[PDB]
Amino acid sequence: SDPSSINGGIVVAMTGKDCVAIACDLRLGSQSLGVSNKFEKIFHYGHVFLGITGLATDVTTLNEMFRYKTNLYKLKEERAIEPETFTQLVSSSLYERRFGPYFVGPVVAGINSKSGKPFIAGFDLIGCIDEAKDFIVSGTASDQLFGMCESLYEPNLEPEDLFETISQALLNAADRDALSGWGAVVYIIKKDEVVKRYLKMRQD
Amino acid sequence: TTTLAFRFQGGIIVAVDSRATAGNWVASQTVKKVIEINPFLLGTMAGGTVDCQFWETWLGSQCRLHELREKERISVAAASKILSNLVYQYKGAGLSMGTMICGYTRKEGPTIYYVDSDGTRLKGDIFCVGSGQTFAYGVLDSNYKWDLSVEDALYLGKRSILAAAHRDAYSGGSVNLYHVTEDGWIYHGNHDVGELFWKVKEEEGSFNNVIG
Amino acid sequence: GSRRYDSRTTIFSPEGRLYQVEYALESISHAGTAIGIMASDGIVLAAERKVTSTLLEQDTSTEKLYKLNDKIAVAVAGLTADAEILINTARIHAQNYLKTYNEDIPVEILVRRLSDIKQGYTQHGGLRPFGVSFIYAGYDDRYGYQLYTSNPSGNYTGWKAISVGANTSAAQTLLQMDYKDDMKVDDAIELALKTLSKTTDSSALTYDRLEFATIRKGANDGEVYQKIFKPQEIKDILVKTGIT
Amino acid sequence: NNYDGDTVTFSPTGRLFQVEYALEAIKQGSVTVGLRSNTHAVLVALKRNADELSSYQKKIIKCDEHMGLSLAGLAPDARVLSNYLRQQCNYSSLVFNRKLAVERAGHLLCDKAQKNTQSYGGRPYGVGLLIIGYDKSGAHLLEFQPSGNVTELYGTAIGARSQGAKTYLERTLDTFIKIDGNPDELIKAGVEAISQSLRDESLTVDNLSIAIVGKDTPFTIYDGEAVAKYI
Amino acid sequence: TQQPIVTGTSVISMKYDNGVIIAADNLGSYGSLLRFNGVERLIPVGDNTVVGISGDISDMQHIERLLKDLVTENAYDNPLADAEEALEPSYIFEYLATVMYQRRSKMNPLWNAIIVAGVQSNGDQFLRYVNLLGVTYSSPTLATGFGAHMANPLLRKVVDRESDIPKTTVQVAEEAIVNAMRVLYYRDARSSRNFSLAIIDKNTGLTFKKNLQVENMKWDFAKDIKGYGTQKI
Amino acid sequence: GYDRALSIFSPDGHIFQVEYALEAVKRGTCAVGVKGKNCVVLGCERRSTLKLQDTRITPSKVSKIDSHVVLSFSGLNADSRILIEKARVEAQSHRLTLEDPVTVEYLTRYVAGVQQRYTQSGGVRPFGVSTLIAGFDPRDDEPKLYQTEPSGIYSSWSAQTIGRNSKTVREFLEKNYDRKEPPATVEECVKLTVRSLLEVVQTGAKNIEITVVKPDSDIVALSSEEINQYVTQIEQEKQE
Amino acid sequence: QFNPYGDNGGTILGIAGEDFAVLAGDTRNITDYSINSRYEPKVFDCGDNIVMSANGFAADGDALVKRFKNSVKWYHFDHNDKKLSINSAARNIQHLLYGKRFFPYYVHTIIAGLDEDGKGAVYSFDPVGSYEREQCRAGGAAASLIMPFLDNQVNFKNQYEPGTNGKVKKPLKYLSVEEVIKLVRDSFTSATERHIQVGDGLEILIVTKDGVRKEFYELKRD
Amino acid sequence: MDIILGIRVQDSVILASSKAVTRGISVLKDSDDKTRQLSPHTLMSFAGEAGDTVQFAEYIQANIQLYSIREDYELSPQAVSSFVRQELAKSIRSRRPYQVNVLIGGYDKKKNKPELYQIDYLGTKVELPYGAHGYSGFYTFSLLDHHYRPDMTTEEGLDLLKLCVQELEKRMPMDFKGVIVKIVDKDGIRQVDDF
Amino acid sequence: DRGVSTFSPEGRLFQVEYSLEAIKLGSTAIGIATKEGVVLGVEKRATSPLLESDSIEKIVEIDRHIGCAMSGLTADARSMIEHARTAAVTHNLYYDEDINVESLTQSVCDLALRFGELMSRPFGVALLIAGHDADDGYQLFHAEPSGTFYRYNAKAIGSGSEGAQAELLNEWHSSLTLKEAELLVLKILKQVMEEKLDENNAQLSCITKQDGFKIYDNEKTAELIKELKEKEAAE
Ligand SMILES: [Mg+2]
Ligand SMILES: [Mg+2]
């Protein structure tokens, strides 16, 4: 019934020293029924990464939409969109459906190509921006992710340390949520290289 | 209501009852539940209302316009789909309809299409629609063969309506028979259930439960 | 009433021609020459900017060669402003198709769409046609490398090598003479620049009076790269081919 | 000349040529006569045929039980205006349970015809109408021109050679106005009036068309052998 | 769809030999609050018609303006506006009836019960009813709201059928009406003592009586009534 | 919106815009249609003023409306695309509602209806296009060939040509086509179609396109070499 | 909440003879337990030898009758004063009713007259336009009290010929206009006794080739 | 309607779809084919609310057939599935949404690979080795999880499908009157007439 | 230029008068009304021998009791026929009866003047509408683009109209049989046609109360042509 918790899933993003990390589980379900273990919730438009939790048809629709918009942005601007600008675009796009919204919990992550500054942001379904320094959480296990991140996180982590933190935050949160899990992916993002790691986790 | 229609060697038999009720009150015993769309097409009326009357006489207007433009008899497939596409536009509004569009053309042969106010459109060999459909289905299924004679097929349809008219409280009055051939439908009379019941009981030896 | 002042843009002449289309084509004949040449391993787009100034900021300037998506580019001949209206429409169609089918739009489908828009302005609406001719250079996995052209009438055709704008008669003869089917991109680059060098109304062909682009499979493995040449890069290729 | 290309253009002398050309179409049309007394009102119309095989074009149209008109000019325009009258007569009856006054019916026709003369794109109506009726203030006869000018009269005529019938009625004014409670004699005066506009041809059985409305007489049209009595 | 706010109660009326009488009290209630004591609910149209209106007062004021506008419109291009082509009761009613039914059919009714009383051109008595549903009916006696339940029974003892109309004089008819208004004051918890009465006669014309009061009331017997059963003191 | 009446009558009772649309057809490349006993063939001219063309991708002159019907044309190319698109949509719409593909006559009647509508609609000019619509009705082995034109009139033909120098090739067909015995085979029909184009075309190289349509959705376009063999055989017989 | 419908009571009765037709209806108009009018005409002459009554919610009934009468008028204008046949009128009424299929005229409509062969005809309509030609039809409040009586006394249902004992039915002999009017009056007298909404007066309209005639009869006023 | 299954094997896609059509209390038909051929190498099975199912299926069919004629080219199964998803995603926020779930089984002639897509009425697309809609997955997925291999032959796929249907016939309350099975491969679409 | 709905100084609509000139250029169509039926006949006028003449449809059915023949810009008639067929069928749906021939004709003629700056120009086609109803019996109407329609006992429209009408003037009487009318149409068509009349370049049709509207077979018409030749050679 509740659109945001039919399909389930989670996304978490963190900042580190000269790097950001974004991670998601792979589950798509129809309430109790597990349907797919390959439903990735993180997408990217150039060097800007977008995680999207919530209703899966909208996750897909919004990805396709932001691809559409960032492609036209690039053709006209003659440059790739930045995380700060994209965040505003996401907020704009969500609020234009103020009285008929996409049931989603987007999360932006990326490094500004010019300043080199790590950036993360989160939104509610209606477009309100949550720009946190430390971390952003989203999905059916957001309470669990808040609890994990709040205790596990410490500022200025190196990329390979940040990976361990965000991975353990996601995994242990998803294991306390019936509608999350079935695999997980973690992106480690630096100014000019990105490493994508699939995690081994319990498949129930 | 009880309406049936079935394909066989000799074409199509259409049989209907005649009762119309508003709650427990019997409003009419002389209702025509077979629409004569045109001389080659028939439609049944189950569903509760004017909806079948209104929209199937309208269907006759569309079939006439078709053969004026195309200089060719409309197919049973096309005719039934004109109706199903129409009621599908009205889906949700509250139309109440359950009909068999029956016809016999060159390219198709004898054809029956069940059309529904939910938008359902099914081709088939035997259909039964109404509050007394289950009773009619019992007699049909146990006695149906493709190689029935026009005489026996007509009787089977009549007897199947009678079976429903007896048990189903909201069916009865009288039985209307039709026989659809390639050269058009042929009316086979109005049969009062009251008289038909005793006639059938005696001649057939059935309804031994009932005292006559 | 208003009828008195109506030019009636969408009518036939007694001969069966569309006045405005014919006059729009006359307009395009005064525009800078644009050339497209299709090779086996890529496409070349070469185009001449019209009598420029020394104070014109060339590196940020774009009047001839535009990008529709990652696979398809166009060369413009005519009113730049009119072209940009159509270009934005084309860019949107490519994205709509991508959103719908989750596949990059085939070149011909995009070309047909734009050409159909142009056609509409010649048949209805009472507005003047777009005074623009395009050369479409593109690639898809069905037909591979493709060259097209469309004009204000809305008619489009396919080409191995083609010119639009000024001196197309002279340009098309020179291309027809030196073009071959087994030709390569580096050879086509040379032909394109040699053709413009001979057909130009200027005294000499220099880097500041040119826009240049190549669509190559010369991208790392099975994929396609668009290269819009920079002023310094156009200057280099002019020396390499031995024109300056 | 230069000012007759459309209805929206005044001439230098202040004329509307398109309206005057529409007025001309009435003069080309067949003659029709209107006249009334204090009890009854009568329409007499000379119908026109295309040839000997053809029928005679109907000239009289009923608008209500107590109102109707005769036409002269473009028949399709008379059909449009008569239909409009039928609706207004009907609106009055349905909404107000009230028979539409003949004077008010004229006001409506005037205003409808006017809008066609002031706007670009449209054209004036190419027909003249003679509306007769019996309402709460007795018998009435109106003359409608497509310029917009509607005029209440005792008697009149419009169409080709209508001047002859109009002069006759002007002489007979004091006689026919007094024909009260006698429909046949009032029609006779109308048939005698329209006869002044005839040349070469005479009033035959399928040529003549007569309509009447009065105190205890609904608007009824007479054609064929019904008018043989008056020939 | 709305709910009535400021309301007017019963309108009562009856035919007599030469015309019609209509009456209605001068109260504008606000629920149980007897808010407005100076509200005229009989609205004369010309010299031959009086429209009595009960129910929502804001909608009454709207209808009042429609009628005022109707008179203006009727005078336009009408030399006989004060003679043969003057507004009839039957015209005024049919107009209102059309509006009432149209409004109910748009699910946005004028929350009223209206009685049009008048005398026609030919001297005929006109008395017809219409309400928020657009339901219309005519009768020798007509009454709205509580009047329907209490006034009609009394008025029907005077004119029980059509043949009793010529036998009923204006003095007998007015007496019956005034008595009915007293009965309603006794028994209707949303009525007032002050009322207006209108007589439309084919001979003497329209007589409009304002500031009338219910009088000759019986209350003395109340002193003897004590307790609710067993109490003696 | 633009409401101007472009197509209107003249004092002599002519609609010049419809007649000037026919002049655009006269300018267009020649198209020919010949129906045999069990096939129809659509021949089309390709003007050789345009070389360095890419014949793979260049719009072909014959277009499939459905799997069983084809449409060729003469006149404004851009205009033809609009009629083809509408026809293709109507073909699918007919299948969707009637549960049966369009008859060649019906599809023709539709396209002709569109063309007519543009001759008395405000703010639009007529199509500068005449079409040849050919094919076979569903479950029918009788060949069908129809012609339309800007005015909106349409009719059936045993054989017909439209476009530039169509007067000449119609002259040829009128003497060479026998109604009592039409081209019995595919070869005979194609041969007669190529022969008729060779009266006008110039060179029989890449200037002739041939498309053969047979019953039960059997449509195929002939290649250069296949057509070139017909061109060779025709002229070798002619040298006598 | 605003309820756009109401129930004005009343009862109507149509009977088709061999060369005539009658459409009767009581003249009482009511709401709840109150009488609005003891004489409010319900059956109307609509012209062209057709009589009509739309029983139920009086506002919708009056609207429908008004619109049908209007339809007769425009039929004459549009089709050269052609007489509207009873079967054509019936079909026209179906469309008037079905036009408001999703906000119905809350009435049970009956019309009566003569068919094109001069025989008696009665047509019966439900609120949304389903209709049928019938020999006999009571409508409205006391319809359930009248129809069974008519099945028995007009169509001779359940009646058999004495001596045969259920073997031979009573023959369906034709009823005269005087015989029908007796059954109409006894139906309404009986209905008045047992139904509170029926009474005051009975108005019958009789349709023949000669035209429409009216007959009024008193009913009990309690 | 009720049960629709799908399984992608080595060189083909197999779609099973029930034959029963129940309207209320009676089974009106026991031979209903709940599928439409969108293109020569693409098949779509469907289940959902009455009327909407066929109306949608035929609408998609017409659009793909229109594309096939216009371009003289068959769209890839992926492209068709993306088109279908978008229509359903558009549908869900309409005045009256299509209540239709579909499986799109196709063979991509370019990649020489079978492909099975599962799309629900919300527009939720997933590419799968095997899929189902409604309560079908609850019974069958445990068997498919156990037995499925990506390199299965078409004959092995059918045997695994029979085991699924048997489990449905055993444990489901509703009688779905068996299934019509169809195979989609490089040679096109064909029906297994004995099952 | 000038308005489409402009009046000339004589009081005529330019466009309507010009559309009448287009009708004069059209092929001949003839109608003859009798008490046994109404006969409609047309000149097909194929522009080439390769044009399959049976596909030339200038006679058309509107309903079972109403037929129609056309002359002029025949493409314009398709929408008029569509409206007529819809009007006939619609009226039957509303009133459970056949529609009067005059009422049908009036409905068609209402379209005529719906042009301006609605359609952009008048129709360039005239119609001979023939039919039967119970009120006025057998009827023949001539519907123009002016919006006016005349009833006729007999009427010819098209290029040979005034010549044919003069012939119909002499030949028509109120006691014609159907067979006499059939030959009379064939006689007058043959007179005004450029090419020699046969069963392939001319078409006959009729409307009777019993059988309704029927287009004649080329075999049936051929016999009537042969019957005509013999009776003209007979004196
Ligand atoms: Mg689990
Ligand atoms: Mg029963």
Q: Where exactly are the structural domains of chain E?
A: 1-233
Please give the CATH topology (third level) of the domain spanning E1-233.
Answer: Glutamine Phosphoribosylpyrophosphate, subunit 1, domain 1 (3.60.20)
Ligand 1 centroid – CA H148 distance (Å): 19
- What's the DSSP call for residue G99? T
Q: What is the three-class DSSP state of E50?
A: strand
Resolution given for this structure, in angstroms: 3.1
Torsion of CA C203, C204, C210, C213, to 10 degrees: 130
| DSSP H or E run through D62 | strand D60-64
How far apart, in whole angstroms, are the C-alpha atoms of residue B196 and residue B166? 11
Dihedral sign of CA atoms I89, I93, I99, I103 in order: negative
Q: What is the CA radius of gyration of chain C?
A: 18
Domain that holds residue A191: 1-204
Count of structural domains, chain B: 1
- H helices of I26-160, in order, are 77-95, 101-112
Chain F contact probe: residue of B67, B68, B70, B85 with most F CBs at under 10 A: B70
- I85 CB neighbours in chain B (<8 A) are 65, 68-69
A9 vs A139: CA distance, rounded Å: 6
Tokens, residue H139: 């019974």
Dig out the tokens for E213 from the structure: 């009061």
Q: Which two tokens stand for residue A97?
A: 């459906």
- How far does H184 lie from chain A, in Å, by closest CA? 23
Contact of F56 with chain I, judged by CB distance below 8 Å, is answered with: no
DSSP 8-class letter at A153: -
Looking at CA atoms only, how far is residue G52 from chain I in angstroms?
Answer: 17
Domain hosting B199: range is 1-212
**Could you tell me if D118 lies within 8 Å of chain C, comparing CB atoms?**
no
Q: Which residues of D touch I17 (CB under 8 A)?
A: none
- Per residue, the 3-state secondary structure of D164-203, as one string, reads HHHHHHHHHHHHHCCCCCCHHHHHHHHHHHHHHHCCCCCC
| Residue A70 φ then ψ, to 5° | -70, -25
Supply φ then ψ for residue B64, to 5 degrees.
-65, -45
Rounded to the nearest angstrom, the gap between the alpha carbon of residue H117 and the centroid of all alpha carbons in its chain is 8
CATH topology of domain F1-240: Glutamine Phosphoribosylpyrophosphate, subunit 1, domain 1 (3.60.20)
CB contact under 8 A, B137 and H26: yes
Nearest chain B Cα to I86, which residue? B65
In a mutational test of the F interface, the residue from I73, I81, I117, I146 whose CB has the highest number of chain F CBs within 10 Å is I73
Chain G residues lying within 8 Å of I94, measured CB to CB? 91-92, 95
Contact status, residue I116 vs residue D122, Cβ threshold 8 Å: yes
Closest in E77, E84, E93 to D136, CB measured: E84
Method: X-ray
CB contact under 8 A, H28 and B114: yes
Q: Residue A200 and residue G189: Cα distance in Å, rounded?
A: 91
Edge-to-edge order in the sheet of strand G211-218: G136-140, G11-16, G21-26, G201-208, G211-218
Chain E residue nearest residue D100, CA to CA = E85
Say if the Cβ atoms of B54 and G129 lie within 8 Å.
yes
Q: What Cα–Cα distance (Å) separates residue G30 from each residue in E110, E117, G146, G217, H22?
A: 21, 21, 20, 19, 48
Q: Rounded CA gap, C21 and C153, in Å?
A: 6
* Nearest alpha carbon to residue H19 among H57, H39, H45: H45
Q: Could you tell me the two tokens for I34?
A: 């009798």
How many CB atoms sit inside 10 A of residue F80's CB? 25
8-state DSSP, D54: B
From B1, B2, B3, B111, active-site residue: B1
Query: Cα separation of H131 and H167, whole Å?
Result: 16
F14 CB burial (10 A radius; 0-12, 13-18, 19+): middle
G70 touches chain D (CB under 8 A): yes
CATH class of I1-235: alpha beta
Amino acid identity for residue H9 in this structure: V
Nearest in space to H35 (alpha carbons), one of H9, H12, H6, H69 = H6
Per DSSP bridges, beta strands B98-105 and B41-44 are antiparallel
Q: What is the CATH number of the domain that holds D59?
A: 3.60.20.10
Kindly list the strands in the beta sheet with E11-16, ordered across the sheet, starting from the edge strand earlier in the chain.
Answer: E141-143, E11-16, E19-25, E194-201, E205-213
The rounded distance, in Å, linking the Cα atoms of D97 and E15 is 21
d(CA F122, CA A150): 70
Cβ proximity of H26 and B135 under 8 Å: no
How many other CB atoms are there within 10 angstroms of residue C118's CB atom?
A: 24
**CA–CA dist G80, G84 (Å, integer):** 11
What are the chain E neighbours of G100 within 8 Å (beta carbons)?
none
- Give D123 to chain C, closest Cα distance, Å: 13
- CA–CA separation, B93 vs B75, rounded Å? 28
**Cα–Cα distance between F147 and F159 in angstroms, integer?**
10
Q: Does F100 touch chain B (CB under 8 A)?
A: yes
Q: How far apart are CA A92 and CA A62, in angstroms?
A: 13
Asked if chain C contacts chain A via 3 or more Cβ pairs within 8 Å, the reply is yes
Please report which residue ranges of F66-103 form alpha helices under DSSP H. 77-98
Tell how strand F143-148 and strand F154-156 pair up. Answer: antiparallel
Q: CB D97 to CB E80 under 8 A?
A: no
| I117 and I3 Cβ atoms separated by less than 8 Å | yes
CA distance G11 to E60: 34
Residues whose CB is under 5 A from ligand 1 (ion)?
A 204
CATH architecture label of G1-222: 4-Layer Sandwich (3.60)
Among this protein's residues, is B1 annotated catalytic?
Answer: yes
Q: Could you tell me which residues come within 8 angstroms of residue F88 by beta carbon, excluding any fewer than 6 positions away?
A: F65, F66, H66, H69, H70
Residues of chain G contacting D94 with CB distance shorter than 8 Å: 66, 70
Name the strand (E) or helix (H) holding B136: helix B133-143
Selecting from I6, I110, I147 the residue whose C-beta is nearest the C-beta of D5 gives I6
Contacts of D6 in chain C (CB under 8 A): 1
Distance in angstroms (rounded) separating the CA atoms of residues F57 and E34: 88
3-state secondary structure of D41: strand
The minimum CA-CA distance between B211 and chain H, rounded to whole Å, is 31
Inspect the interface and report whether the beta carbons of E137 and G62 lie closer than 8 Å. no
Query: Min CA distance, C56 vs chain F (Å)?
Result: 36
Measured in angstroms, the CA of C10 and the nearest CA of chain A are apart by 33
Residues I120 and F5: beta-carbon distance below 8 Å: yes
Query: Looking at the partner chain, which of F98, F106, F139 has a beta carbon nearest the beta carbon of B78?
Result: F98
DSSP per-residue string spanning H49-93 = STTHHHHHHHHHHHHHHHHHHHHTSPPPHHHHHHHHHHHHHHHHT
Cα dihedral G50, G56, G58, G63 sign: negative
- Closest chain G CA to residue I93: G91
Q: Which residues of A touch H88 (CB under 8 A)?
A: 57
Number of domains composing chain A: 1
Q: Which residue has the tokens 């179609």?
A: F193
Cβ G6 vs Cβ G31: under 8 Å = yes
Tell me the one-letter amino acid at A41: K
Cross-strand pairs, C65: C75
* CA dist., res. H79 & res. C98, Å (int): 10
Q: Which of D76, G78, F151, F22 is nearest to I77 (CA)?
A: F151
Q: Which stretches of E76-222 are DSSP H helices?
A: 89-105, 146-156, 170-187
* Distance (Å, whole) CA C140 – CA C106: 6
Give the list of residues 6+ apart from residue A109 with CB closer than 8 angstroms, or none: A13, A20, A21, A22, A48, A49, A50, A51, A83, A119, A120, A121, A136, A187, A189
Separation in Å, CA G138 to CA G121, G150, G155, G182:
14, 9, 14, 15
- Dmax (CA) of chain B: 59
Rg (CA), chain G: 18
Q: Are H182 and H190 in contact (CB under 8 A)?
A: yes
Query: Could you tell me the distance, in angstroms and rounded to a whole number, from the CA of residue A9 to the centre of ligand 1?
Result: 13
Q: Which of F37, F39, F42 is closest to F193 using CA atoms?
A: F42
Tokens coding G145 = 């009290």
Q: Which residues of C touch F (CB under 8 A)?
A: 3, 6, 8, 10-17, 38, 108, 112, 115-116, 118-119, 122-127, 143, 146-148, 153-162, 172, 175-176, 179
Considering only CA atoms, give the Rg of chain D: 17
- Tell me which amino acid residue B5 is: A
Residue positions counted in chain E: 233
- Supply angle C-alpha B105, B108, B113, rounded to 5: 90
Q: For residue A63, give both structure tokens.
A: 């990805």
Instruction: Give me the active site residues of E, please.
Output: 1
The Cβ of residue B4 has, within 10 Å, a number of other Cβ atoms equal to 28
Nearest Cα to Cα of residue I113 among I147, I79, I82: I147
Which residues lie below 8 Å from residue C144, measured CB to CB, with a gap of 6+?
A: none
I102: nearest CA partner in chain G: G79
Specify the CATH number for the domain of residue B28: 3.60.20.10
Q: How far apart are the first and last CA of chain E?
A: 53
Q: Strand, helix or coil at I221?
A: helix
Tell me how many domains chain H contains: 1
CA–centroid distance for I172 within its chain: 17
Across the interface, of F64, F93, F96, the residue whose CB is closest to H69 is: F64
Find chains touching chain D: ≥3 CB pairs under 8 Å.
C, E, G, I
Half-sphere exposure for C43 (CA within 13 Å, toward CB): 29
